[PDB]
Design brief:
It is found in: Cytoplasm. It is an enzyme of class 5 (isomerase). PPIases accelerate the folding of proteins. It catalyzes the cis-trans isomerization of proline imidic peptide bonds in oligopeptides. By secondary structure, this protein is mainly beta. It has a single domain, classed as Chitinase A, domain 3, CATH 3.10.50.40. 9% of the residues lie in helices and 33% in strands. It is built from two helices and six strands. It is globular and about 40 Å long. 27% of the residues are buried. Bound molecules: 8-deethyl-8-[BUT-3-enyl]-ascomycin.
Length: 120
């Protein structure tokens, strides 16, 4: 499943649940270290609804703590938390990927900051 490493610690009280909307700042890199996207470089944070299949599965799993099932190496991310998500080609864009930006069978690394959840 996805992998999460916690670089920094949030409030530890605010966690996203499926159907919740989250706001995130992120940089996305390949395992080789080349950046393919940054929310901050754009100057705009990303907002989405998690747990509805709106975004790739690795994002849905990490943000909702696996829909509350819990997971191996799956620590929960809270508001103000900084974490690294490693997403396998499954749970992301797969064998096809999305040209131009992503090659076939790519493992993706996201460095993310969870600015807010829902009302916040
Ligand atoms: C005209 C409007 C298009 C509309 C584009 C935007 C609102 C701007 C928004 C910042 C996207 C960025 O545009 C610069 C750019 O973000 C990336 O760089 C990226 O960091 C990424 O991977 N993200 C974004 C952050 C959340 C996780 C993931 C995602 O799941 O995002 C979602 C995603 C691509 C889902 C695919 C869709 C195809 C399915 O087949 C596949 O199923 C496996 C899942 C995004 C939100 C789409 O739902 C919404 C859109 O497409 C992609 C590398 C390519 C993507 O551009 C496409």
């Amino acid at each position: 499943l996805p992998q999460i490493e916690i670089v920094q610690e949030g409030d530890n009280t605010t966690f996203a649940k499926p159907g919740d909307t989250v706001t995130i700042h992120y940089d996305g890199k390949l395992t080789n270290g080349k950046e393919f996207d940054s929310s901050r470089k754009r100057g705009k944070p990303f907002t989405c609804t998690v747990g509805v299949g709106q975004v790739i599965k690795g994002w849905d799993i990490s943000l909702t703590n696996n829909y509350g099932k819990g997971g191996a190496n799956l620590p929960k991310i809270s508001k103000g938390t900084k974490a690294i998500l490693t997403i396998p080609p499954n749970l992301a864009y797969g064998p096809r990927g999305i040209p131009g930006i992503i090659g076939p069978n790519e493992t993706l690394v996201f460095e993310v900051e969870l600015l807010g959840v829902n009302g916040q």
